[PDB]
Amino acid sequence: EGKLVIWINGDKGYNGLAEVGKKFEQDTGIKVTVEHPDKLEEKFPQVAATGDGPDIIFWAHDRFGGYAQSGLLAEVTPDKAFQDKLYPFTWDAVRYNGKLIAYPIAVEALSLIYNKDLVPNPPKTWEEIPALDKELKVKGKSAIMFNLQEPYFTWPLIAADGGYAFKFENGKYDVKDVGVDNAGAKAGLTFLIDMIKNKNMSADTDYSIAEAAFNKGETAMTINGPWAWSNIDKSKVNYGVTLLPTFKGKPSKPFVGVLSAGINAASPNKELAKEFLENYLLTDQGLEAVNKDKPLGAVALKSFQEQLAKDPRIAATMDNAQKGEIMPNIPQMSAFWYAVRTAVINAASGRQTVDAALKDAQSRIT
C-alpha cells in the first residue's frame, strides 16, 4: 500500500511509461515501479488469485475477459466527462458483462513494413511475393521475413479468405417475444382502470382536455413531454417537471423517442436536404429557433445540449428517459402501437376486461 507496481510487456514503451511514473511521484510522492516480466499475461492470474501481483496490468484487451470472469479485475469508474475523452469503440473493447474492466490506451494492428530502397512499389498481393523473392535472392536478400512463432502475425493471412475466431451475432429484437399481456403489463393497466372506476380519471380525456385542465389550474398534475412546456409557460400556472410516479415500488418506464428527420428516397433535392439538416437545423442557432417555439427536450447536438442540461425540466426529462427504454425502430413497432392503443381504449371504456384486451393485443402483435 502507498505504491504502484505496473506490469507491461517488454515490446512496449516501458521506459517512457516509467517517466510518466516519475512525474506521478514528483507531484504526489507515490513511487511507481514499472516491470516487464516474461509471460506476464500468464503469471497475472496466478499471482492475482493469491492476492498478490501488480496494481496495474497492461495487455491487449483479448486477455481481460478471462481475468474479469475470474474476478481478478476491479471495475473501473470513469465519469461521463472522462469517458467522452476516449473513442467509444475502445470502451467497448474493455466492457465485460456490462462493466468496464480496464482503461483503453492504444489501438494496434499489423501492417506491411517495407524498405523503400529495396521495393519502391511494395507488392499489393501475397501471390506475387515468391517472384519478388527470387529476384532478391540473386542479390543475397529475401522478400519478406516476419515472426512465425506467434499466431498473431500469421492470422491476417489465415483470415483473409474466410478464417475467423468466434462468430459474432449482432444484437436484435426478438419479434416473437412480446410483453404486452404478462402479469406486469396487466397490473399497470388494471391500476389505470381502477383509477377510472374510482372516478379519479375519465376514459374520454384526450390531449386537448388534459392540457386545458392543467394549464387553467383545474388539475394538479399532468403527464406530457417537452413540446407541451411552451403553452404552460404562457399560462398562469407555476409548474415543475419531475420523475413519473413509481408503481409497486418500481419506476415508471416511458418510451424514449428520438425526433428524427428522414430524407424521402423519391426526393430530387437530397443534396439540398443534407445541406439544410446538417448546416442549418443541426446548429446551435437552428435548434434554438425550433426550441424557442416548442421545446425539443434534450437535443442530439452535443454543443446545444450542454446549454440545456442545466434546466431542471431537461434534467427531469433525462432522468425519466434513463428509467425508461429507447423505442425500437423495427417495422413491427407500428403494429405494436396500434394493438396497444386498442387494448387501452377498450379496457378504459369497459368494452373489454384488462386481461382480454391485452391478450388480444398480444395475439395481434405476434
Ligand X SMILES: OC[C@H]1O[C@H](O[C@H]2[C@H](O)[C@@H](O)[C@@H](O[C@H]3[C@H](O)[C@@H](O)[C@@H](O[C@H]4[C@H](O)[C@@H](O)[C@@H](O[C@H]5[C@H](O)[C@@H](O)[C@@H](O)O[C@@H]5CO)O[C@@H]4CO)O[C@@H]3CO)O[C@@H]2CO)[C@H](O)[C@@H](O)[C@@H]1O
String marking each residue 148-177 x if it binds ligand X according to CB under 6 A = -xxxx-------------------------
Site for its own copies in 128-147 (CB under 8 A): 128-130, 132-133, 136, 140-147
How near is the Cβ of 310 to its own copies at its closest, in Å? 16
Site for ligand X in 2-41 (CB under 6 A): 9, 11, 39, 41
How near is the Cβ of 30 to its own copies at its closest, in Å? 6
Q: Count of CB atoms within 10 A of residue 189's CB?
A: 21
Residues 6+ apart with CB under 8 A from 96: 64, 65, 68, 69
Scan for cell 499489393, then name that residue: 124
Q: Count of CB atoms within 10 A of residue 176's CB?
A: 8
Site for its own copies in 215-244 (CB under 8 A): 217-230, 232, 237-244
Residue 39 binds which of its own copies, ligand X, none (CB < 5-8 A, kind-dependent): ligand X
Of the CA atoms within 13 Å of residue 259, those in its CB half-sphere come to 15
How near is the Cβ of 200 to its own copies at its closest, in Å? 5
Q: For residue 34, which of 12, 63, 5 has the smallest C-alpha distance?
A: 5
How near is the Cβ of 360 to its own copies at its closest, in Å? 14
> Whole-angstrom Cα distance, residue 25 to residue 20?
9
How near is the Cβ of 114 to ligand X at its closest, in Å? 20
Site for its own copies in 241-260 (CB under 8 A): 241-260
Cβ-based nearer residue to its own copies, 226 or 352: 226
How near is the Cβ of 198 to its own copies at its closest, in Å? 6
Should residue 29 be labelled a site residue for its own copies when binding is judged by CB under 8 A? Answer: no
Should residue 14 be labelled a site residue for its own copies when binding is judged by CB under 8 A? Answer: yes
Residue 97 binds which of its own copies, ligand X, none (CB < 5-8 A, kind-dependent): none
In this structure, the dihedral spanned by the alpha carbons of residues 265, 270, 276 and 282, taken in order and rounded to 10 degrees, is: 50
Scan for cell 376486461, then name that residue: 353
How near is the Cβ of 215 to ligand X at its closest, in Å? 17
Site for ligand X in 219-238 (CB under 6 A): 225
Number of residues that bind its own copies (CB under 8 A): 252
Site for its own copies in 325-354 (CB under 8 A): 325-334, 336-337, 340-341, 343-345, 348
> Whole-angstrom Cα distance, residue 111 to residue 109?
7
> Whole-angstrom Cα distance, residue 39 to residue 87?
29
Q: By the 8 A CB rule, do 225 and 297 touch?
A: yes
Q: By the 8 A CB rule, do 41 and 63 touch?
A: yes
Should residue 56 be labelled a site residue for its own copies when binding is judged by CB under 8 A? Answer: yes
Residue type, 250: K
Site for ligand X in 49-78 (CB under 6 A): 60, 62-63
Residues 6+ apart with CB under 8 A from 54: 5, 6, 7, 35, 44
Residue type, 162: G
Q: By the 8 A CB rule, do 144 and 129 touch?
A: yes
The residue range among 211-219, 260-268, 281-289, 333-341 that interacts with ligand X, by the rule CB under 6 A, is: 333-341
Chain residues binding ligand X by CB under 6 A are 9, 11, 39, 41-42, 60, 62-63, 108, 149-152, 225, 257, 334, 337-338, 341
